[PDB]
Design a protein around this ligand. Structure first.
Ligand SMILES: Nc1nc2c(ncn2[C@@H]2O[C@H](COP(=O)(O)OP(=O)(O)OP(O)(O)=S)[C@@H](O)[C@H]2O)c(=O)[nH]1
Ligand SMILES: [Mg+2]
Length: 180
């Protein structure tokens, strides 16, 4: 019943498309297929509510600062994905977060930090640093492997939960109005 607009963001090659295709299609693309902009719908039951997910799988490839704006205005929550063997992709999260906060003109934007490719050896981004970054941001951190499907549903369902929490918070706000 309730629709949630989710946007999967992050550097090229982190696994945004692999995560999203696991969620929607239940298989893993070993392939490379760089994304311009694909979207997907899926009907899910999360905490006993039916949810219509409308998911945008974005381009990691850059230039943008053109393209990012409209889908940042549109998105209700953001899956901020880095790959655990890609230091720059982790560092990129700060910049995506800043951009989203600026473009949506809010300090309060539902987000989940996703460390993908946890099936691989010799990670270059430690779990502790990701956890520490998420704690700073006051957002969940979930480790995934699109290859094995580990954590995939949890990552997307947790983002829906963050949106719901935000919706409830915004009704009560901090002040000005109040509600519940
Ligand atoms: N080992 C491993 N490989 C993965 C995982 N997720 C994605 N990959 C691989 O990484 C490569 C890039 O994945 P892809 O999903 O296309 O990245 P992207 O983030 O969507 O990249 P883009 O569209 O912005 S350019 C592919 O070869 C894919 O199979 C994972 O969890 N584990
Ligand atoms: Mg892609």
């Amino acid at each position: 019943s309730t629709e949630y607009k989710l946007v999967v963001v992050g550097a090229d090659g982190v696994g945004k498309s692999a995560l999203t295709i696991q969620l929607i299609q239940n298989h893993f693309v070993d392939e490379y297929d760089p994304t311009i902009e694909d979207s997907y719908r899926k009907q899910v039951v999360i905490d006993g509510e039916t949810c219509l997910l409308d998911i945008l799988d974005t381009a990691g490839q850059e230039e943008y600062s053109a393209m990012r704006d409209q889908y940042m205005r549109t998105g209700e929550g953001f899956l901020c994905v880095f790959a655990i063997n890609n230091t720059k992709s982790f560092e990129d999260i700060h910049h995506y977060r800043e951009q989203i906060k600026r473009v949506k003109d809010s300090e309060d934007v539902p987000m989940v930090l996703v460390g993908n490719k946890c099936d691989l050896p010799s990670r270059t981004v430690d779990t502790k640093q990701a956890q520490d970054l998420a704690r700073s941001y006051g957002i969940p951190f979930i480790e995934t492997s699109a290859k094995t499907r580990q954590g995939v549903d949890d990552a997307f369902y947790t983002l829906v939960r963050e949106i719901r929490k935000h919706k409830e918070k915004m009704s009560k706000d901090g002040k000005k109005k109040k509600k519940k």
